[PDB]
Every structure is written in C-alpha cells, then in structure tokens.
C-alpha cells in the first residue's frame, strides 16, 4: 500500500512536470534580446563599518534606509547609522550563537536567534534607556535559520527542524505552524503585502505559504542542491533563490516554474545571499568565493562584480529606497556600496 | 561642521566601541571546547566529572586559573553541515565514545564514522581532538564475557582488556588523514579522580602552546 502511495506520488509528479513543460513555451532571455545591456556596473565602497570582532551572520536594513542592525557570533547585535558609521546600540546577547537578525518595520524592536532554539525580541525604545529583551519565543526544536517581522506584534521564524512558525509576541505562544518541508529551512521572505511568503529549505524546494490560514500553496523545484537564500521580487509575483550549485534561479508564483538561471561555467561556488535592486533590473548575489556578483536580471550576463571582502559574504541587503547595498562577510566588516 | 548634538552621538559611538573592544579582549581569554558524541556516550558523565534550553548548552567553569566554556551541542537533531562551520575557531573538540558499546550498524561503527566525519573536516583541519573512552569498568566485564572480534572482524589477539582497549584506541586514531597538522589525544575517562579534568587541561595547554609557536613563527 505504501508502494501504491509512492507510485501515485510519482505519477502526480510526472503529470505536474508535463503540465509545466506544456506551459514553458519560451524563456525570459530570448524575449529580452532587444533590450540594450545595462553596461559595466562599477559600484564603489562609500562606507566601511568595523566594530565586529567575529563573523557577521546577519544584517537587516531599517525601513528608513539609514539605520541597520547586524548580528555577529562574538555575541553582539550592533545597530549602525550607515550615514555616519556611528554605533547607535550594541546589544549583548545571552547566547552568542546567533544566525539571524531582524529590524522591525516600525524600528521599535529587533529580533535574533540561533542554535539556542529561541527567538529573542529586544525593545529598542524603553524609557530606562537600556535595550532589554522583551520576549523569548521558545517553541522550536532546531537552530533559528531566519526570522522576519510582519509588524510590531507578529514575527515569522523558520528553524532547522523543517517547520516555520508565526508567533504572537505579546502572549509568547505559537500562533501558527507551517509544516511541509523535508530538510532544514534556511531562509524566509515576506511578500510586499506580507500576506504570503516563500521559504527555502535543503530539499532544493521553495514553498509558498499564506500567513493567515497557515497552508502551503505551491512548491518550486529546479535546484540541484540546498537553497541558502531567497528574495522576493519587489512586484511580489516572483522571487530569486540562491543555491549551493552556484546558480540563482528566478521563479514565478503565477507560472509556477523557473524563468531564468544565472550561472556560468567559471563560477562553481554556492550562493549565500540574494537581493534585488529597487527597480528589479539587478540581482545582487553574494558568493562563497569571497566576491559578490551583480547580474543583469533581464540578460543574465554579469553586470558587475563587488570584490572588497576577504572571506565569505554571509549577508547582503539593499536599502528599501535602493540607494546602497550593504554586504557583510565573515571577516567582521560591513561594506556599503553605491 | 558637526552639530552640538552630533558630537554627543559620536562620543556615544566611541564609548560603545571601547566597551565592546574590551568585551572581546575578555572573550579572547576563554578556552572554547566543543563536546561531541552519540547516544549514551557518557557526555553527561563528563559534565558531572567537570562539576528549558533546547539546543546548544554552554557550561562555564574554571580550573587551575583557566576558564573553560564547554559547548554541548546535545540534541540539535539537525543537519550538522549547516551549523558546524560556526565552530571553526573553537579551541579543542572533546569527543566522548563508549567502550561498552562494542557489543551493540553497530554503535561502535556509528561512533567511528562520526569521529571520522568530524575529524577530517573542511573547518577542523587544525583543531585538536580529545578522545574520551567511557565506561571501561563495564567494558571490562563485557570483554570478559564476549570477544571483541564480534565488532572488529579483523581483530587478531587476546581477549583481554589492555589489548582490546589498545586496539580500539589505534583504530580511532588511525582515522585522521592529516596527522601532521592536528593531534588526537586520548584518555580512558572512567577514572573517577581529577585526572579527567587534568588531561583536558594538559591538552588545551599543548594546543595553545602550539598556536603561540605558530603565531611567533617557530612553527
């Protein structure tokens, strides 16, 4: 009977692949052949933030595109003012094994977690003047791979036990659980409206979830190995995934299939972070070969390279207004490029 | 050029910077050990000998004027490939292994495979291992009862504690391909005296001496 279920699943997969092939009449690259190349993009480092004493594992831009939080497993959450390079806050964490950080859209809270299996929320605007942890959300059983704020009271966290979760910060309990992944979840990406989000896991599949009802809508396959990063296209109808196969794949929610692959035989290192520009014409891919790359999303040819780091680019982000791109590496230096 | 209210911000930035620099200076004097094992490998026994939160558990203590911070990954139940690289800078890797599990695909072979995987690693090409061999008191009666060859088909020798233990030790220590850039210490940890902590202290002293030599340039 189990063999019967497996056979039915395989037949369903075959039917789905056949349907996708029937719907894959063309690809993005050909229809954009008449668009002139963006040219050689040569960004320069306008700032360098040097306060961390260990590897940088997460950074997140503020909604005002000036302040940014960054987490390092020296045990510190440092909030930088990128305009003036001043350290606004330096929160000491209870567990130094931080793997993720979040800056609330309102700017009032930050969140971080990691191998401690707990997501801690820090209140930045307490009257006492000292940042203090307001809630320790403990309902996971694995490392907190990522976390993101829906608002000042809702947070989504994807963990290493293969389940994502939606929390109620005030009550400290788990509001909803998102199950359906087979391998560890490595990233999260809220949609522009924050109604639905995509999570990438080690199964090489990115799953679409609707926050309110807590179901899974779609599964996107096409990667040959794990997915390290996932970014939502600003339009909110597509998202780009970076994988260990040195390939960045563009996926569409409506078509439910891959639109483009950004790779060339020269580069054989896995991705670590992916992010789009404000207009979506550029895809910024942080690599483990120490060199960030800038892909012309409409042409797939390398628009440029960002080589200013001496270790893995662990995190990459773009200001909400698209003015600058912050890259944080394992050498403890953030660099703002523009 | 700077507003009267911006120089205060710069002063706060500098004060935070000099606070976190001294915090890192303090952290640089901590001996970070990573505890590893499998099943009932006696890791609880090692913690007891030394002496709410799922995942990594940190235990800090001081012995003979040195501060140890033992990180027991414990029940992570997750792909180690995605969270082991954060321990690249650890000082030493304590590795507990049961010797009464030679009877029980085998538990000894599982431990051996885990040891090989975590010893020959992209990130632990220099960190020294400290192998603990637990439960020798019980393994004594177990080897008196049944032969060890049931676990090692190639084993050739007598069915005695000293030789069985020597063979197990040699089999574990032969798994490291890079014998020149990292050493594998060993101690039959069932010893209930303070030797259990003394051996770790000696191994960490040797490792830090080697690191200091490498920095100075002698090595």
């Amino acid at each position: 009977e189990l063999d019967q279920l497996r056979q039915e699943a395989e037949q369903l997969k075959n039917q789905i692949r056949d349907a996708r092939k029937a719907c894959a009449d063309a690809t993005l690259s050909q229809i954009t052949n008449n668009i002139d190349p963006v040219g050689r993009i040569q960004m320069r480092t306008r700032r360098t933030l040097r306060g961390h004493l260990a590897k940088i594992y997460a950074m997140h831009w503020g909604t005002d595109s000036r302040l940014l939080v960054s987490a390092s497993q020296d045990g510190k959450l440092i909030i930088w003012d990128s305009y003036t390079t001043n350290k606004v806050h330096a929160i000491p964490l209870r567990s130094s094994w931080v793997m993720t950080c979040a800056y609330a859209p309102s700017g009032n809270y930050v969140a971080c977690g990691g191998l401690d299996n707990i997501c801690s929320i820090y209140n930045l605007k307490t009257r006492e003047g000292n940042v203090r942890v307001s809630r320790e959300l403990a309902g996971h059983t694995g490392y907190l791979s990522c976390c993101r704020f829906l608002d000042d009271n809702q947070i989504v966290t994807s963990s290493g036990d293969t389940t994502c979760a939606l929390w109620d910060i005030e009550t400290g309990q788990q509001t909803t659980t998102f199950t359906g992944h087979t391998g560890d979840v490595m990233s999260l990406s809220l949609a522009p409206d924050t109604r639905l989000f995509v999570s990438g896991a080690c199964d090489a599949s990115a799953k679409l979830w609707d926050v309110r009802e807590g179901m899974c809508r779609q599964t996107f396959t096409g990667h040959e190995s794990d997915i390290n990063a996932i970014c939502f296209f600003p339009n909110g109808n597509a998202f780009a995934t970076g994988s260990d196969d040195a390939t960045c794949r563009l996926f569409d929610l409506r078509a439910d299939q891959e639109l483009m692959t950004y790779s060339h035989d020269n580069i054989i290192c896995g991705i670590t972070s992916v992010s789009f520009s404000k207009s979506g014409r550029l895809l910024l891919a942080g690599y483990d070969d120490f060199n960030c790359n800038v892909w012309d999303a409409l042409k797939a040819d390398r628009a440029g390279v960002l080589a200013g780091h001496d270790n893995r680019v662990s995190c990459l982000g773009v200001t909400d207004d698209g003015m600058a791109v912050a890259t944080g590496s394992w050498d403890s230096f953030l660099k703002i490029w523009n | 050029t700077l507003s009267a209210e911006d120089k205060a911000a710069v002063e706060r930035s500098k004060m935070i910077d000099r606070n976190l620099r001294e915090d890192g200076e303090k952290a640089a004097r901590e001996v970070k050990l990573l505890l590893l094992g499998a099943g009932e490998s006696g890791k609880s026994t090692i913690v007891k000998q030394m002496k709410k939160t799922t995942g990594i558990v940190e235990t800090h203590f001081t012995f003979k004027d040195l501060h140890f911070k033992m990180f027991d990954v414990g029940g992570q139940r997750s792909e180690r490939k995605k969270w082991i690289h954060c321990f690249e800078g650890v000082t030493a890797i304590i590795f507990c292994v049961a010797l009464s599990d030679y009877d029980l695909m085998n538990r000894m072979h599982e431990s051996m495979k885990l040891f090989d995987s975590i010893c020959n690693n992209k990130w632990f090409t220099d960190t020294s291992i400290i192998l603990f061999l637990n439960k020798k008191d019980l393994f004594e009666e177990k080897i008196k009862k049944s032969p060890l060859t049931i676990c090692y088909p190639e084993y050739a020798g007598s069915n005695t504690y000293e030789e069985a233990a020597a063979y197990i030790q040699c089999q574990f220590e032969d798994l490291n391909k890079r014998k020149d850039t990292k050493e594998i210490y060993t101690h039959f940890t069932c010893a209930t005296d303070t030797k259990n902590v003394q051996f770790v202290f000696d191994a960490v002293t040797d490792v830090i001496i080697k690191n200091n030599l490498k920095d100075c340039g002698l090595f």
Epitope: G129 | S3, E5, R12
Partner: antibody, heavy 121, light 113 residues
Framework: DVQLVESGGGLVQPGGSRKLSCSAS????????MHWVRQAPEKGLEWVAY????????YYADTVKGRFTISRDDPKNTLFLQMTSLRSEDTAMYYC??????????????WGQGTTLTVSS | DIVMTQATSSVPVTPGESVSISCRSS???????????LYWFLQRPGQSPQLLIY???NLASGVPDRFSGSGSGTAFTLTISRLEAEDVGVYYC?????????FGAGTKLELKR
C-alpha cells in the same frame, strides 16, 4: 519608575559654597548625559551645567564658569553640582535633567522636582 | 549666544479651542545635516517642566497628539488643536544647535472665563 530626587537646597550666605545632589533611580543612570538647569524666582529657565555620559565632556554656562563644578558618581547613581562664591543672583530652583544623545533619541525627556537655593545674608 | 524670543504672554483662550505659541531665533537653527534643533517644554503650575517637542517636529513620548510643532529655520510654532484645562502653564522654546543652550522668555498660557 524614573525618579530624580534633588537635595542640598536651603539658605546660604553670599560668598559661601554648597553642594546640590541628584539621586537617580529607576533607569540606567550611566547611559545618560545630565544637565543642571536653574529657574530664578518668578522667572524663566537658564541652562547651568552639562556633564556627558561617562564624564567625557563637560560644559558650563558663562554666568557660572569657574565657580560651579559638575560631577557624577555612576556607582551610586548620583549627580553633584558643587557651587563656590555664590552671589545674590544665584538664588533659584535647580532642576536635574537627563539627556541621551544618539540617532533619533529624545534629549531633555525628564526633569527632577528641583531643589530651592536661597543665597541671601 | 543664540537669542530665543517669544511673546511675554498669549491671549487667554477657552478649553476646546485651538491655540498657537510662536518663538524665533536670532540665527538659523537648520544645521547642514537637515535637523532643526529646537525643543518645546511645558511647565505647569507648581511643577517641573516636561518635554513636548524635540527637533521641532517630533512629539515626545507620553505627550497627547494634539500638540504639534512646525516652523521654518528661524521661526517656530507650537499648536494645540484642542486646548484642555491641563495645558495651562508656561511654554518654553530652547535651542540645541550650539552650546550654551538658551531658553526662551516663556509664554504663559492661561484660561479665559
């Protein structure tokens, strides 16, 4: 709750000296810069002194420079203003004010209840 | 120093009606970094002052929303949309662009009957 309780006020002859104390409770005293601001009887406010966080920078009003010394004991959560060569114009209510300076902070967000100093012969 | 000028007193107004308090500085308070450094404080009868506005447009925590700040580089206004019996007292404008910090004369908002 945040509290700044002042003490040391009273009657002083002209030319004397007096120490005003500000006991801070309910907040991280060491993270805040501090100000002393004086209000003359039936008159407006006048800024007197400022001591940064950690005592790294100090400023005085020209009317008091050289005569007042501002200090802080962080371990005891206390702020001190020692006044020497008091004049008749120095009679007033002295307020202890906290002020934290960074991006987006709100300086001058809390004032003490003030202590009355009467410099008269 | 920077000289802050206000009216000695404002016309008394009834509760529920809007009211405005003006202040002006001898020099432009608009720093090159975009921040206009000006703070508005309230001192009620027999009490210590308390911050109302900081940097000319930002409402301090715990202050009712009716209070609002505005103004150009060298002219500033604090508006109370609907007065209450608890708004009576002295309103001070203070500049933080350069040391020393110079307050204003203080406008004494008082009720009408």
């Amino acid at each position: 709750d945040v509290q700044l309780v002042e003490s040391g006020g009273g009657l002083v002859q002209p030319g004397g000296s007096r120490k005003l104390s500000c006991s801070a409770s309910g907040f991280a005293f060491s993270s805040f810069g501090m100000h002393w601001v004086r209000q003359a009887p039936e008159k407006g406010l006048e800024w007197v002194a400022y001591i940064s966080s950690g005592s790294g920078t100090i400023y005085y009003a020209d009317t008091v420079k050289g005569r007042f010394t501002i200090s802080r004991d962080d371990p005891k959560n206390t702020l001190f203003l020692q006044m020497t060569s008091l004049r008749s114009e120095d009679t007033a209510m002295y307020y202890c004010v906290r002020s934290i300076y960074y991006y987006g902070s709100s300086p001058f967000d809390f004032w003490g209840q003030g202590t009355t100093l009467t410099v008269s012969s | 120093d920077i000289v802050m000028t206000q009216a000695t007193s404002s016309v008394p107004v009834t509760p529920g009606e809007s009211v405005s308090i003006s202040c002006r500085s001898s020099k432009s308070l608009l720093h090159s970094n975009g921040n206009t450094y000006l703070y508005w404080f309230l001192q009620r009868p027999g009490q210590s002052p308390q911050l109302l506005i900081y940097r000319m447009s930002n409402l301090a925590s715990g202050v009712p929303d009716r209070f609002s700040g505005s103004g150009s580089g060298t002219a500033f206004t604090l508006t109370i949309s609907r007065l209450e019996a608890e708004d009576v007292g002295v309103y001070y404008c203070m500049q933080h662009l350069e040391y020393p910090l110079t307050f204003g004369a203080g406008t004494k908002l008082e009720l009408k009957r």
